[PDB]
Structure formats: structure tokens, C-alpha cells
Structure 1
Amino acid sequence: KKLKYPRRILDVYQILQSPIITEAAIKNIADENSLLFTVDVRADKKMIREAISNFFGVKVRKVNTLIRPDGTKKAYIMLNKEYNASELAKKIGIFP
């Protein structure tokens, strides 16, 4: 009916803070085609889906969030099976 209010008011350019690069994440890329991104605690799944969908220009299957014991949201982004993960891994600078 009305304008679609995003669940909170955030500014999208600050929500995806960084790729998390460790031995763990890289094989999630290899096996799952799933990126690992530390994001703003206040950020949701719909926000993250639009953000990556527009930013890197890839259609994203499903998102899974997490909250560290340190209070920092962490997101598994599993892309579709059409777009290969390692594509975006080279495009970003995460080397498998």
C-alpha cells in the first residue's frame, strides 16, 4: 500500500564491512559457493540481499546470518549455481 519501510534505517554503504578471510571461509567458497562477509549488527537479511545483488551484480540464492559472541554480525552469502563463487573471489581479492 505504502512505501516499503526497510526494517531499520541504516545506510546501505556501511552494512557490508568486510570479507572474512581465514582457512575456514575459503573452503565454504569452494564447496558451497558461499561468500563470508562481516556486516553491521543492525543489518538484516533483506538489506544484505539487495546490497550484494546490486553491488557485485549477482543473484543470491540464500543468506545466513550469525552473531558472534563479540557482537558482530557475520553473513554466509550463498549465491546461485549459475554464478560461480571463485569468480567473485578473483574479482574481490580473495584467493583460493
Structure 2
Amino acid sequence: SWDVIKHPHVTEKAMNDMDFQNKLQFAVDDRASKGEVADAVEEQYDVTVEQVNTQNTMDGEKKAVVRLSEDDDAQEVASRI
């Protein structure tokens, strides 16, 4: 069985979204829907996902921009990994 989340997509742009918009970026399985990405993310980091934007990348994988609620802090959730 395949897992939803593959690993954190950490790049300059990914940082700006994390520091400035409280969003975490992930490399997810391309069969995964925004909904499945939202859930998975919550259950793995114990946070509240507000929105999820996806993109099928020219690397062959899927990339999801997950925005957390003002209650959660991206910078911190990412700092523990």
C-alpha cells in the first residue's frame, strides 16, 4: 500500500511560504487528492490544515502547498524534522 506523504519539499520558495504564509510544502503521491493530503498532514504533525493546493510536477511527482491555521505555526512544525 502506498503512503500519502513522501517527504518535505524544502526549497527557497518553500521557505518563504512557511515564514510568510504559514504553509508547508510536501512531495506527495500523485494518486493523492487534496483531501487525502489534508488529512494525512494533520494526522502526522497534529495540526489543522486550512487549505491544500496541488501541482503535478515535471519531476514526475506531486507537490502540495498545505496552509495551516493561525493556531498552528509552520516554522515550528517544520523545525522538528
Same fold (TM over 0.5): yes
Task: Give the Cα–Cα distance (whole angstroms) in 1 for the partners of residues 6 and 53 of structure 2.
Answer: 16
- State the shift of 1:87 in Å: 1.2
Partner of 1:7: none
Q: How many equivalent residue pairs?
A: 81
Partner of 2:48: 59
Query: Which runs of 5 or more structure 1 residues have no equivalent in the other structure?
Result: 1-9
Q: Which runs of 4+ in 1 moved over 3 A?
A: none
Partner of 2:27: 38
Q: Which has the higher contact order (CA 8 A, sep 6+)?
A: 2
- State the shift of 1:23 in Å: 1.3
Q: What letter corresponds to residue 42 of structure 1 in structure 2?
A: R
Higher strand share: 2
Task: Give the Cα–Cα distance (whole angstroms) in 2 for the partners of residues 73 and 17 of structure 1.
Answer: 10
Q: What letter corresponds to residue 53 of structure 2 in structure 1?
A: N
TM-score (norm. length: structure 2)? 0.91
Write out per-residue CA displacement over residues 26-82 of structure 1, whole angstroms, 9 at most, x where no aligned residue.
Answer: 111011100010001111111111111111110111000001123211000000011
Match 2:10 to one of 21, 26, 29: 21
Aligned-pair identity in percent equals 35
